[PDB]
Amino acid sequence: PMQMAYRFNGIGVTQNVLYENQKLIANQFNSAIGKIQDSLFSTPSALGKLQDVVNHNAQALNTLVKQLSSKFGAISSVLNDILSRLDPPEAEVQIDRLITGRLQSLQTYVTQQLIRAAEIRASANLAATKMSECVLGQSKRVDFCGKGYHLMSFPQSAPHGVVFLHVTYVPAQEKNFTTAPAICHDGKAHFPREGVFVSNGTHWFVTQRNFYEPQIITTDNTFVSGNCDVVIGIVNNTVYDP
């Protein structure tokens, strides 16, 4: 729980939320992990990019062994018959033809393998970066370790690849409010330190930016800078002193 409090603090949400909603958060996490198994099992075409590699390698091998039956404009496709049917000179000619064809086949196969290896190397470097940044730490990069603000990432092995489970934070149940950049109390403008100024119609509160938690405006929540004649949308309320 302290680790996840640190994780929450790294996306802008204070530590009160986790310690005050631990049971709900644990239930949500358990339900999500439960649904992951069914989501993977039900859909057949989920691990598709992993299947494509195996299919492409099998197809490459199969075409390579299928072209061994090609005749390449020779008498036949077997060395034994070509040898034991005709004279040494025409034998040299036919063997030269077959050798050229099969060298061409090998060259094509090797070039294709090199290109696909380059692509898989790029993918592997990306996987290593994701492992280093999402599993060994917390990432502030947007939409790199999952949709939404990042909390955790867990790895899992798979045939010829890896599967990352990204645990992320998504806000919900929004509410409308009226805002104001600054507040003038005694001729001097006050700006918030970590939140935004909101009002439900009658009173004014200072809150966070990702989870509603109103607090009364006091001198230990706001800082003063300049008079009140230069800012545009400045309202006039009270800043209490404790």
Partner 1 sequence: FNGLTVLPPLLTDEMIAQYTSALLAGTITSGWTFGAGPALQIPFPMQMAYRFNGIGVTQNVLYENQKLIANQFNSAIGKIQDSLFSTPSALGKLQDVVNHNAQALNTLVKQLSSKFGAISSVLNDILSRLDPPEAEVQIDRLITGRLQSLQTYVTQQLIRAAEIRASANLAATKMSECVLGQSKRVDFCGKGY
Partner 2 sequence: VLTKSNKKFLPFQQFGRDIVDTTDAVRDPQTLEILDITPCSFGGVSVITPGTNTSNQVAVLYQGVNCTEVSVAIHADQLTPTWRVYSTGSNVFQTRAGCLIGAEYVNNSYECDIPIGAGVCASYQTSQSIIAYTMSLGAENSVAYSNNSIAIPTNFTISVTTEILPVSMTKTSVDCTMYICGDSTECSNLLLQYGSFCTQLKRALTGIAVEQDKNTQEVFAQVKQIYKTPPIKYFGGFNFSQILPDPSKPSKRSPIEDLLFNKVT
Ligand X SMILES: *[C@@H]1O[C@H](CO)[C@@H](O[C@@H]2O[C@H](CO)[C@@H](O)[C@H](O)[C@H]2NC(C)=O)[C@H](O)[C@H]1NC(C)=O
Q: Binding partner of residue 200 among partner 2, ligand NAG, ligand X, none, CB under 5 to 8 Å per kind?
A: ligand X
- Name the residue among 147, 64, 146, 72 with its Cα closest to residue 106: 64
Q: Binding partner of residue 110 among ligand NAG, partner 1, ligand X, none, CB under 5 to 8 Å per kind?
A: none
User: For residues 12 and 208, is the Cβ–Cβ distance under 8 A?
Assistant: yes
**What is the CA 200 to chain-centroid distance, rounded?**
38
- Name the residue among 3, 30, 8 with its Cα closest to residue 211: 8
Q: Binding partner of residue 73 among ligand X, partner 2, ligand NAG, none, CB under 5 to 8 Å per kind?
A: partner 2
Instruction: Find the part of the chain contacting partner 1 (CB under 8 A) among 26-34, 78-86, 138-146, 157-165.
Output: 138-146
- Name the residue among 136, 140, 156 with its Cα closest to residue 148: 140
* Nearest to partner 1 of 37, 173 (CB atom): 173
User: For residues 227 and 188, is the Cβ–Cβ distance under 8 A?
Assistant: yes
User: Min. distance of Cβ 178 from ligand X in angstroms?
Assistant: 11
> What string of H, E and C letters represents the secondary structure of 180-197?
CCEEECCCEEEEECCCEE
User: Min. distance of Cβ 100 from partner 2 in angstroms?
Assistant: 8
* Nearest to ligand X of 18, 198 (CB atom): 198
From the list 30, 36, 236, 240, which residue makes contact with ligand NAG (rule: CB under 6 A)? 236
Q: Please give the Cα distance from 24 to 30 (Å, whole number).
A: 10
Q: Binding partner of residue 93 among partner 1, ligand NAG, partner 2, none, CB under 5 to 8 Å per kind?
A: none
Q: Does 136 engage in binding with partner 1 (CB under 8 A)?
A: no
Find the binding residues for ligand X in span 182-201 (CB under 6 A). Answer: 200-201
- Name the residue among 11, 2, 1 with its Cα closest to residue 151: 11
Residue 111 tokens read as: 């070039």
Torsion angle of the four alpha carbons 213, 214, 216, 219, in this order, in degrees rounded to the nearest 10: 60
Q: Binding partner of residue 184 among ligand NAG, partner 2, ligand X, none, CB under 5 to 8 Å per kind?
A: ligand NAG
Q: Does 202 engage in binding with ligand X (CB under 6 A)?
A: yes
Question: Which residues are near ligand X by CB under 6 A?
Answer: 200-203
